[PDB]
Amino acid sequence: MELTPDQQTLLHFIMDSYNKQRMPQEITNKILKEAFSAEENFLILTEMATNHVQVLVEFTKKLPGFQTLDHEDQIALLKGSAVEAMFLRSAEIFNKKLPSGHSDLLEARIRNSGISDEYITPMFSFYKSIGELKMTQEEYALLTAIVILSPDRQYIKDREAVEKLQEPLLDVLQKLCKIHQPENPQHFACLLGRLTELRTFNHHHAEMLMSWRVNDHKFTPLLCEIWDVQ
Amino acid sequence: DHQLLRYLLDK
Ligand SMILES: COc1ccc(-c2nc3ccccc3n2[C@H](C(=O)NC2CCCCC2)C2CCCCC2)c(OC)c1
Asked: Where located (chain B) (predicted)?
């Protein structure tokens, strides 16, 4: 049931890399402090997402065996997972405990950010669903690593090589679910289930951004590569 | 097609 020394090593290594991300408080403090216009909010999103992608590439490069993979497959994994990892990180930030009334203001500020109503409902549905899972930081880190090392991504030439890298992370996550939540034996299945709902955010991500109540949708050259916009 | 991504990966 317990983690082996090799698994404990893997977990702490993944945790240290995951911890290099912009702190959730640095994000919520800005949104909660002042109400910004839809124009200012689009620029905040774009800057946030550019920092997220940069840190995500550095996290991905540290994943055991990632640099042994074929160069084209490395690109396909990063490009295939960037949007999903972004929404998983936003779901983590959204569900962090804040003082009484702060989370309600946060949801209200995100609701009036400039995004269309059509996309608000499924976004908060996912955020609430992941929040009900009461995930630990280790679970978010491993789940992000599992999302990145998905062998079923399009344009992957060597799926087996990706499978070999994802399998020990899946084993570690399963053990943690059994340790953190022995009451809920469905917890691991629930986590893996939430990964299919993450995939739905891919199909209409570009439409989500273009529907923003702003005159000009300016993206950085890095976001254009990752989001297929402009 | 993804030269910035390639660069960040090949740093
Ligand atoms: C595609 O449309 C949207 C809409 C909303 C969000 C979103 N959901 C959030 C939940 C918790 C806190 C922040 C959140 N955000 C934006 C943000 O800053 N997202 C960052 C992206 C990179 C990884 C860290 C989070 C905010 C929303 C309020 C206006 C300013 C942007 C979003 O993030 C995927 C994407």
From this structure: Nucleus
What φ, ψ does residue A216 adopt, rounded to 5°?
-125, 130
What is the rounded distance in angstroms from the CA atom of residue A204 to the CA atom of residue A218? Answer: 18
A228 φ/ψ sector (left φ>0, alpha ψ -120 to 50, else beta):
left
Which method, experimentally, gave rise to this model?
X-ray
With a 6 A CB cut-off, is A53 part of the ligand 1 pocket? no
CA distances from A4 to A9, A175, A185 (A): 9, 10, 21
Is the C-beta atom of A87 inside 6 A of ligand 1?
yes
User: Closest Cα of chain A to B2: distance in Å?
Assistant: 6
Residue A119 marked in a binding site: yes
Contact A57 B2 (CB under 8 A): no
Beta-carbon contacts of A57 under 8 Å, excluding residues fewer than 6 positions away, are A78, B5, B8, B9
Q: What string of DSSP letters covers B1-11?
A: --HHHHHHHH-
Half-sphere exposure of A36 (CA within 13 A, CB side): 19
Q: Which CATH superfamily is domain A1-230 in?
A: Retinoid X Receptor (1.10.565.10)
- Residues of A whose CB is below 8 A from B1: 225
